[PDB]
Design a protein around this ligand. Structure first.
Ligand SMILES: Nc1ncnc2c1ncn2[C@@H]1O[C@H](COP(=O)(O)O)[C@@H](O)[C@H]1O
Ligand SMILES: Nc1ncnc2c1ncn2[C@@H]1O[C@H](COP(=O)(O)O)[C@@H](O)[C@H]1O
Ligand SMILES: Nc1ncnc2c1ncn2[C@@H]1O[C@H](COP(=O)(O)O)[C@@H](O)[C@H]1O
Lengths: 289, 100, 51
């Protein structure tokens, strides 16, 4: 496949922006300052540095912040308030080896690494200097593939509809209602290990979307409704980006890249959610052709 | 956020270079005096056994104020499974600590 | 007497400087250090949060 050949012939280095910022936490850092540093810097993940061992040992991402908030909320109900002054190392102890990639590794290896390990963050680490150079994402990769692959030769499957390809998830879709408390959302996130939740109504029609990303805004209150929390919507919002089963892989990939979101909600004529199509599904389907 | 370059002092330039040699000697780093106001300092990582190098340069920014500048040297240093960059930060942090 | 600061070597940054150490005013016993480095033609500014 053209995608497969392109991925194998390009290095991870080629994906790195000319200029970027990286946020690193010493594992002795207190968890509460760690998550305030993510927000302030507008970053979604941070490599962890163990000073005693003199090396990176893991990642701190929004998923962890959510695990910790959820734990904090429950514990509080039982008068346990320890997560506050917790160091990162101590909270890691309470409970996933570092997975990284060399800038000289192929794009194919990067993609396989994300899928196999079920992660969303892949630090590019130079084996020579030992420095983390950049954190690779599904989003960055797909955009790059779309930009740098010629439209033709075009694989036949790119013209196939979602219906035919069966890419994405179409059963047991974790969803919340507009009247759903933020703390209930956290529990669903933690249980289902899913990057976002469609917000539906009485009849099951999607009207909004609640992402793991929309949660960290809260480290800069867990009682408010999902709807109410999605009013501090920092970015201009045109409504929920969706797709239909009749649509081609090509149109869906184009929509994803242009909108720069991690997933579309598959929906029927009535805006009723039928499934989810995520960059995770897309990249996987492309790496297995 | 407000970022500051290196560290400032209002002591005499000679006095400043004195304190930094002492801070260096305390951490047990190696150092070479290029200029009276320019030092290269080397250090072997206790864990990774690799070496890291950096420059210490004193500048005058005021009539009464001086600025000690830290620069990492890209000499193929660090990389022991460590990080040249992070290890640079730690050498500096330690020095800045001993001062103050 | 020491050399005068080079004009492009900025003393303060608000939100040739390559490899130079920058830092925030210490607060809460946490130190934040920063610097921009180069890997071939790619530049990254690393911030380290250290107690
Ligand atoms: N590159 C990585 N290496 C090791 N662990 C990771 C990596 N990326 C994410 N994780 C962890 O895996 C879990 C899922 O994170 P995420 O993929 O960001 O939703 C979180 O607990 C992360 O801390
Ligand atoms: N709200 C959801 N409910 C059920 N499955 C989902 C949901 N969101 C994503 N998935 C699936 O979980 C896998 C990882 O997607 P993501 O969490 O978006 O990286 C993909 O196969 C998605 O189709
Ligand atoms: N399918 C979608 N439709 C509309 N907005 C979305 C969609 N997916 C994510 N977002 C928003 O885009 C931002 C980035 O989320 P993510 O795509 O998870 O990185 C979040 O604020 C989401 O609420």
């Amino acid at each position: 496949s053209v995608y497969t050949t392109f991925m194998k012939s390009h290095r991870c280095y080629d994906l790195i922006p000319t200029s970027s910022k990286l946020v690193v936490f010493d594992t002795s850092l207190q968890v509460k300052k760690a998550f305030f540093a993510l927000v302030t810097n507008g970053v979604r993940a941070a490599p962890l540095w163990d000073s005693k061992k003199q090396s990176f040992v893991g990642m701190l991402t929004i998923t962890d912040f959510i695990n910790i908030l959820h734990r904090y909320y429950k514990s509080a109900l039982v008068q346990i308030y320890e997560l506050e002054e917790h160091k990162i190392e101590t909270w890691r102890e309470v409970y996933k080896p570092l997975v990284c990639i060399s800038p000289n590794a192929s794009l194919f290896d990067a993609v396989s690494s994300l899928i196999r390990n079920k992660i969303h963050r892949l630090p590019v680490i130079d084996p020579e200097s030992g420095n983390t150079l950049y954190i690779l994402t599904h989003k960055r990769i797909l955009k790059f593939l779309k930009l740098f692959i010629t439209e033709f030769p075009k694989p036949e499957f790119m013209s196939k509809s979602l219906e035919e390809l069966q890419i994405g998830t179409y059963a047991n879709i974790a969803m919340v209602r507009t009247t759903t408390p933020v703390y209930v959302a956290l529990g669903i996130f933690v249980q289902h290990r899913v990057s976002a939740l469609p917000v539906v109504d009485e009849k099951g029609r999607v009207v909004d979307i609640y992402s793991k990303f929309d949660v960290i805004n809260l480290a800069a209150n867990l009682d408010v409704s999902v709807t109410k929390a999605l009013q501090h919507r920092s970015h201009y919002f045109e409504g929920v980006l969706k797709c239909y089963l009749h649509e081609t892989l090509e149109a869906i990939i184009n929509r994803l890249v242009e909108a720069e979101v991690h997933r579309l909600v598959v929906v029927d004529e009535h805006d009723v959610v039928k499934g989810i199509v995520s960059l995770s599904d897309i990249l996987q389907a492309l790496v297995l052709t | 956020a407000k970022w500051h370059l290196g560290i400032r002092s209002q002591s005499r330039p000679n006095d400043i270079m004195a304190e930094v040699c002492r801070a260096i000697k305390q951490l047990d780093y190696e150092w070479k005096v290029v200029n009276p106001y320019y030092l290269r300092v080397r250090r072997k990582n206790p864990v990774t056994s690799t070496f890291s190098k950096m420059s210490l340069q004193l500048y005058q920014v005021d009539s009464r104020t001086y600025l000690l500048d830290f620069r990492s040297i890209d000499d193929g240093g660090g990389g022991g499974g460590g990080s040249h960059t992070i290890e640079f930060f730690e050498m500096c942090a330690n020095l800045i600590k001993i001062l103050a | 007497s020491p050399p005068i600061l080079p004009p492009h070597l900025l003393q303060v940054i608000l939100n040739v400087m390559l490899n130079h150490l920058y830092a925030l005013s210490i607060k809460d016993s946490v130190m934040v250090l920063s610097a921009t480095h180069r890997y071939k033609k790619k530049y990254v500014t690393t911030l380290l949060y250290k107690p």
